[PDB]
Design a protein around this ligand. Structure first.
Ligand SMILES: Nc1nc2c(ncn2[C@@H]2O[C@H](COP(=O)(O)OP(=O)(O)OP(=O)(O)O)[C@@H](O)[C@H]2O)c(=O)[nH]1
Ligand SMILES: [Mg+2]
Length: 179
């Protein structure tokens, strides 16, 4: 049985949503930022004991689209709440805003927390730039703690830029959780 699964990604502008989808579905990384309006992707993968067909909905992180974004939440198997690990702020109150929008659509919808750009954890520009904000990249441990406080089923993370296998792994796990 080829199982079918609808996943929606949401999160702040530039947090890494499209980069993940392009890697997963097109084996393509976009080094230059092009803001998303809306896009759909299709990916097939094997998830443990199943072939799964993923229907993936890419949304804009911009508040300009707040009135129209919830329309893609219908009949979703999970919403992937994404954040940039290098920006303890796409996390901060913003993941609360994001979590509430998903709750306000339907409290029954499953939420997975996805950390993006994990390669920036050891990047020296990121480290210093954040240090004089008295901050540091989000660690794996912090990701898990955030997932708990946002009622996400799991924290998963990757790097679209340096590890395509980290991305395929996120979506394999996401699919098993929805099956
Ligand atoms: N260092 C690093 N940069 C990344 C990674 N993934 C994406 N980026 C960078 O961040 C930019 C923004 O990524 P996107 O995927 O386009 O951002 P987005 O979440 O889709 O943003 P919106 O469409 O505006 O909501 C990319 O063009 C890359 O320059 C990553 O894994 N590591
Ligand atoms: Mg995008």
């Amino acid at each position: 049985v080829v199982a079918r699964c609808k996943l929606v990604l949401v999160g702040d502008v530039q947090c890494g949503k499209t980069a993940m989808l392009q890697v997963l579905a097109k084996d393509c990384y976009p080094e230059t930022y092009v803001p998303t309006v809306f896009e759909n992707y299709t990916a097939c993968l094997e998830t443990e004991e199943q072939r799964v067909e993923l229907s993936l909905w890419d949304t804009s992180g911009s508040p300009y689209y707040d009135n129209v974004r919830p329309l893609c939440y219908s009949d979703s198997d999970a919403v992937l709440l994404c954040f940039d690990i290098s920006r303890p702020e796409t996390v901060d109150s913003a993941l609360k805003k994001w979590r509430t929008e998903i709750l306000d659509y339907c409290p029954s919808t499953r939420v997975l927390l996805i950390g993006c750009k994990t390669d920036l954890r050891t990047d020296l520009s990121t480290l210093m730039e954040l240090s004089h904000q008295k901050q540091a990249p989000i660690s794996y441990e912090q990701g898990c703690a955030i997932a708990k406080q946002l009622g996400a089923e799991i924290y998963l993370e990757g790097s679209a830029f340096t590890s395509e296998k980290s991305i395929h792994s996120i979506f394999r796990t996401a699919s098993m959780l929805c099956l």
